[PDB]
Design a protein around this motif. Structure first.
Motif, short mmCIF file in Angstrom:
data_model
loop_
_atom_site.label_atom_id
_atom_site.label_comp_id
_atom_site.label_asym_id
_atom_site.label_seq_id
_atom_site.Cartn_x
_atom_site.Cartn_y
_atom_site.Cartn_z
N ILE A 64 30.29 -19.32 37.17
CA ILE A 64 30.41 -20.77 37.02
C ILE A 64 31.82 -21.16 37.45
N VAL A 65 31.93 -21.85 38.59
CA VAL A 65 33.21 -22.14 39.23
C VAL A 65 33.50 -23.63 39.11
N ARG A 66 34.59 -23.98 38.42
CA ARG A 66 34.96 -25.37 38.23
C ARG A 66 36.36 -25.62 38.75
N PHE A 115 33.68 -20.51 26.48
CA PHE A 115 33.96 -21.42 27.58
C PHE A 115 35.15 -22.32 27.26
N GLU A 145 30.63 -25.11 41.45
CA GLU A 145 29.50 -24.41 42.04
C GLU A 145 29.16 -23.20 41.20
N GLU A 192 29.96 -32.20 36.45
CA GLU A 192 30.76 -32.56 35.29
C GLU A 192 30.26 -33.86 34.68
N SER A 226 36.90 -19.63 37.50
CA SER A 226 35.57 -19.04 37.47
C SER A 226 35.32 -18.40 36.11
N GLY A 241 42.68 -17.06 36.95
CA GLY A 241 41.69 -17.44 37.94
C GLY A 241 40.25 -17.25 37.48
N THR A 242 39.98 -16.15 36.79
CA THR A 242 38.62 -15.80 36.40
C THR A 242 38.60 -15.28 34.97
N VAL A 243 37.60 -15.72 34.20
CA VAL A 243 37.34 -15.21 32.86
C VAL A 243 35.96 -14.56 32.86
N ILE A 270 24.50 -26.81 35.18
CA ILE A 270 24.44 -25.66 36.09
C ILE A 270 23.12 -25.74 36.83
N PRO A 280 34.72 -16.09 43.79
CA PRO A 280 36.14 -16.33 44.05
C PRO A 280 36.99 -15.30 43.33
N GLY A 300 24.50 -22.85 44.12
CA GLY A 300 24.17 -23.90 43.19
C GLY A 300 25.38 -24.78 42.92
N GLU A 301 25.14 -25.79 42.11
CA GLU A 301 26.12 -26.81 41.80
C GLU A 301 26.46 -26.76 40.33
N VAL A 302 27.70 -27.10 40.01
CA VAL A 302 28.13 -27.33 38.63
C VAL A 302 28.65 -28.76 38.58
#
Lengths: 474, 474, 474, 475
Positions: free
Chosen positions: D138-140, B417, D121, C123, D469, B426-428, C137, B442, C119-121
């Protein structure tokens, strides 16, 4: 001894009868608080319902301004307030001051979270073609009068955690502090009065449970109850609520599940920090270790090394372990220790009790026939339970009547996530101790640990209802 | 071979000239599509703007019904459409049929995501006390006419990914398919027409770049441009968009970072699947392995064994490696391969070319002076680049002008992370190949990989705007 | 005249004893349903809890697929089911078929709403700089076994309104229909069984309230109670729930407030439609007109003319006014009518009763000393109450123990919005009758009208909890 | 009393070899000079921003918010000092200039608190396909990078802060280009951010001539986002140069005030005059054309006339309602629209007079669609009344504009007003009120040639953020 008063409709009021409050660690008389009658409760509630209309009709900015002012005053007076809080509930002096600072942070955050209250616009045409010109304008409204009941172990922080979310949304509030903790609650009330909170918008109630305990809850004026305390008391309040909404923050028996691949040293650090903070008088403390047998011997040794480092003494010297809240609490804890010794548990640290100051006790080889495997001590005793499979650890964790939080210690995070899905708790922390914070996160518990979701935005949502206005576009 | 027609205002139209489309793998004549004039483009756009008024005022449920019916027809005809798609772009037959099925899944999901979208109610009193009786009723509206430009490598799926989100929100749409892929795009249009899509709500445009390429983008009727294709062409579209919003899905050079604690067999399986799917003609392919030197020899061996098992041949035979889209594409890939050979890379699998069928080439000991370290091949060649630190892997990954996705293969997820935070993508994906899916997630690329966020709900958000109605409560 | 059976763990089970059901309008014998024993209740719940793990571990899309199939079967069998529902609860034939179709609509909508509850993330750095690497999460989980208790007046629609939102979130469900309405509920169960719903995921319970009434609600297997019915029954069920969450949809006495600038003919049209639908046997239903003096004579004449034209007769003839559900219900309504007459109200339309078919009675000059001003009739009687000020209308509206919905008739919408803010109700409809729909809108009542928020997305949220997984990024 | 001002570049204050002298449009008073940067000096600004981005984006939201709150506190402290100069620099009423600074601080504070509680989200693969039920995303949120913020002469502080604070709270770095006329006020705003302690390079300023750096600042590859308020022709130019970078444009408007037969004419006239002539009509959101039903047109025109005659015409320092326009070109253009309307037969209900660039407020009745004033945005104190026969005609004429910012509807029938609003090609419709940007939490957006993107506070923050993401499989 300083004589304290309740805030009622913008004025400070004595009662005919008083309760004297003593410092648990020393017996020092700290002051007296009023012992209200039922008629005096009626007056608090009547003044709150009268204030509600003008308070709910203010703007969000104006209500937030009061909360920000009250928080600034708490910061100003944090040392003054913390010093008394420390004595009243035998909390370390530095920790007591920190509780006040954290309360100001929560109040400020709630003010800014709540003033951004938004509503929804729903389309009839999402559901039915014939209703495509019908829309619903859905806005949040206060529930009305919130009865906030704070607990002895956070008499300021877990008063403000209820007061500020309620107030920003346009509710009016009556705070009932615990008797032990009523001085600190009234000291918090001073900050809201100095900030200029309008008369009756925020009030305090103090008194004896035998006079007003059921009365304050059953009163028809009360629209919402927000309670933190013991599981038995919470369940009884729930019976008196009727169909009125209630929030309950009750006990916990949080498990710390340690897997074979875990960093046992780091696990021990977090486990001891979480288990023994404020002598274990916290719902969110690590309260039982469920450890895989092949790593149990070394985990036990790692935990012991840190327990023996915990300082033991008086609140004014900022000891890790301070005296418990009263003699009933220390007697209950000693009774759990004795049951574990009788049934064959191995004490890894030495039990010592001087008054109600119990030294931290660590047990290994705890089994499910011992009370300490299940009952919440609210004291500085930590059991270790050895399991043979992860499935067994999950089964024993979930067998508890409590379900507040859990910790999982491991280096396999995808595995930890799958375990967390199976745990009957509100929050699972990975490779760290259980905790309520940060205060923006949701805080909730399953089964006998309570009802409702707190954390700031969740608490605001809980103490509002929605009002839907539907009309047809032409 | 059949003669195909554009869908224009509910009618099927030929043009005076056409474009004959041939199968890249075999030279087989597949059919012809119209070569539209600028005047014929004008008719498409004028028809769409006339249809927008009645389309945007339908209910969400009515628009969703058309979309669901179109998706059902696509499933029914998945073989018919996929068989031609397969020949048109030399995609394996099974993969092409699967593309059509996926399109139906995206269309259905977009219909249901879009139809329950909501507006919001904002409070003037959140910002200013004097405005406490002022509220804003904010509802969603379409942007207008969406020009959807699909790519050769997903001529149906990345047509539907634009059309359905646009349509559910009340936009009207013109689809410009790639000339190679235009038959598949017109076959998609037949499904929407059979579903009953109202005249002008959805239309197609086909023709030669020299005649209409710039014209379709610069036209004042277009309110939104939604494009997938190569980075140079996307840069051209940006220069033509003026003030109109655009979405771009362009090239990538996705890195797969493999740390010392990775499951090397899992990594190799994912790397080979992602790198060589559709012969590497995917923006989301694993296109460079960045591996810690201490596991590089073993990872290389595992990848080599898998690459040697890939089938090389014709689309009808579902070969892993099919012929590339045209001769220029294969020439370009051959040059990258030659540059790496000449600069000393180790060819772990051997280069051969028959027509435009290039065998899958795996290079080890690639260095960043080699073109293949950086340039997007859109062909079946993969470099392994050895690094000595994670920091070097991050630096090399981020040096790329592309920033679409990345993969991290490791058992330390908190560390992964932390790495993901530093990667300019954009995405990992953790312990998985890079991929667009699942289509609710997304999908977006940084830097030269594009602009805007897709995945279903994000694509809908992008092609909607808002209209606010503000009034004072009395 | 069939012998119906309960759905229990995928099997259809008779009981030793059964209850015969007759049509309220004719006395026709419709069939019998099982009189379950407490042991049979235990077996239902044991089946549900056994099925829960495999059901909640399915994907959302898989659970949605079962629900869509059940809805398709309901549409297919709408005429067949509606024909029996009509007889069982003396609802107009066409209205009963409409109820079945609406149930299919709600089931389909819940399936698609529930599969995209995201769901929500959160910070940590939103609250505390020291926690900027800590994230939360937050995902939703089912609550477990939901007990759904449907009402006689919508025995299919307000069964499916509970079942489908529960099932999509991964809950298991037991449906207890009212005895009058149990055939219709078991007919709904058939659609879910034919759809292939796995054994024990959905079950039914039927029997005598004397034997199993309290038993089904107090059973510890039940994790959530979802009830629609009368206020006295729902209040008693609330006491038996303990600390478990419960939703209550109880009675109403919805006001229709008519101001001096109202469209009186429009107000009368909506008032009559809402007050007399299904003979007034609806919780959401205009049940008192609060009309400004100066337009009261005019409004009363408009209402009267419409009431005189309502058809009175048998369900099979689709009469507006059908026989009430049983003799006790009609006796109660007759008693309210007689009380209003005795205290001096003007009967603008004539009372008539044959069997339990009461003709619709419109009363003018009703005063707050009359039972009819306050008590919910669940019959075809409507009082007009004259008021002199808007303030009085609000006061009288809010003086009711009920608080479900209200209507405001006026051409001044900003003023109506301000009035709506003051009404203690869930929903205010402007220039239209009160109604539950559209079913995506929130549906909730204040005070004795119940607890919890339904409408589809709200009902799904209510029958889930959240699970928070917190970890620290490195 | 004229000072030599400097740009904030990488924590330092920098002069350039050439400068631009700024004069007060109402009087000619020399106010000071600002640097005339070269392209090489722009390169240094951007290079310092990109270097600062790495440390800035990794700070907590709390830490970024504190800088913004301090800057806002400093602007409130210096509101009188800053407003006094802003008043002279753009010929805005002195009191209104001080109010602009105060509003800037309010938006900065609100943006800090809006941005710090933004959330990510988590999405489920099992929403879409059963095979992926254990896969979650996991989208930040993340910043877009370097934001180029370009403020306008008519709100050189407020619509600089409206860009800077949303950008900064989200972790973007910022370069502010003020308009030359307004650049002193922009640099005065920058001083507050500097004093608040904003880290070197996180916020910077650029001043210069369009002929030297105009295109250069936008085309530069270091820029990840362009956020511009200004004229429609300039915004069109920026769109040509944006490439694939996201942009936001707040351009011109020709907002209609639609007055139905059932309208509250007294309230309509009051709002129409206030909205139309505020800051001499030099606002994109001014009421710029009245579309009034024939039946009530005579009465409405009479009442508007009376209120226009009450407006003071004079100098900024005297807080005149109508102040001199920003420059001579602006006044020449407005005079031309007035002459066209006169020559085509419009009724001048109030008299045109021009003294330097101070134009008296001109109200015209019987304006027809063959007249330039029916369509062209004056940015001056002239208002046409267009008599229409139906609401359908008012919608038709309103939408025929190339502009599409806001509209007002004056009517007592709100459900009908909502249906009209649905048909208007604008971002916001105000019922029984003048058009306006505020309150600043509300969305602000224009369709067509009025711009691109959605502002208001939370919307502007969303626009200048992207997402990252991270996808993994639960075991």
């Amino acid at each position: 001894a300083k004589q304290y008063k309740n805030l009622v409709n913008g004025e400070w009021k004595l009662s005919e009868n008083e309760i004297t409050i003593y410092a648990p660690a020393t017996g020092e008389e700290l002051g007296s608080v009023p012992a209200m009658t039922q008629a005096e409760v009626d007056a608090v509630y009547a003044s709150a319902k009268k204030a509600l209309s003008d308070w709910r009709t203010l703007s969000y900015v104006e209500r937030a301004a009061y909360l920000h002012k009250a928080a600034d005053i708490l910061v100003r007076d944090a040392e003054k307030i913390g010093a008394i809080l420390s004595k009243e509930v035998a909390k370390g002096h530095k920790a007591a001051v920190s509780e006040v600072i954290r309360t100001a942070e929560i109040i400020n955050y709630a003010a800014e979270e709540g003033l951004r209250m938004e509503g929804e616009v729903l389309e009839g045409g999402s559901f039915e073609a014939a209703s495509k010109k019908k829309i619903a304008i859905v806005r949040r409204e206060p529930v009305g009068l919130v009865l906030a009941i704070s607990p002895f172990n956070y008499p300021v922080n877990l008063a403000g955690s209820k007061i500020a979310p309620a107030l920003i949304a346009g509710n009016v509030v009556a705070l009932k502090p615990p008797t032990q903790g009523s001085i600190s609650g009234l000291l918090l009330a001073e900050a809201f009065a100095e900030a200029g909170i309008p008369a009756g918008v925020f009030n305090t109630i103090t008194g004896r449970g035998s006079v007003i305990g059921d009365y304050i809850v059953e009163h028809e004026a009360v629209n919402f109850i927000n309670f933190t305390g013991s599981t038995p008391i919470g369940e009884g309040i729930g019976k008196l609520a009727g169909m009125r909404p209630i929030m309950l923050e009750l006990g916990g028996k949080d498990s710390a599940i340690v897997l074979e691949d875990a960093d046992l040293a780091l696990a021990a650090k977090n486990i001891v920090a979480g288990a023994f903070g404020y002598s274990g008088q916290r719902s969110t403390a690590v309260k039982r270790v469920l450890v895989m047998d092949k790593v149990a011997d070394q985990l036990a040794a790692e935990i012991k090394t840190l327990v023996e480092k915990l300082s033991v003494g008086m609140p004014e010297d900022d000891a890790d372990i301070t005296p418990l809240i009263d003699t009933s609490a220390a007697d209950f804890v000693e009774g759990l220790i004795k049951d574990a010794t009788d049934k064959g548990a191995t004490a890894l640290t030495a039990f010592n009790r001087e008054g109600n100051l119990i030294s931290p006790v660590l047990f290994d080889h705890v089994t499910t026939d011992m009370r300490l495997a299940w009952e919440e001590p609210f004291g500085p005793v930590l059991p270790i339970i050895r399991v043979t499979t992860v499935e067994e650890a999950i089964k024993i964790s979930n067998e508890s009547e409590y379900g507040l939080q859990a910790s999982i210690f491991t280096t396999n995070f995808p595995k930890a996530f799958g375990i967390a899905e199976q745990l009957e708790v509100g929050t699972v922390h990975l490779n760290n101790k259980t905790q309520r914070g940060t205060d923006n996160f949701p805080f909730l518990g399953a089964k006998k640990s309570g009802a409702g979701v707190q954390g700031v935005k969740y608490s605001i949502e809980a103490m509002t209802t929605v009002k839907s206005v539907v009309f047809d576009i032409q």
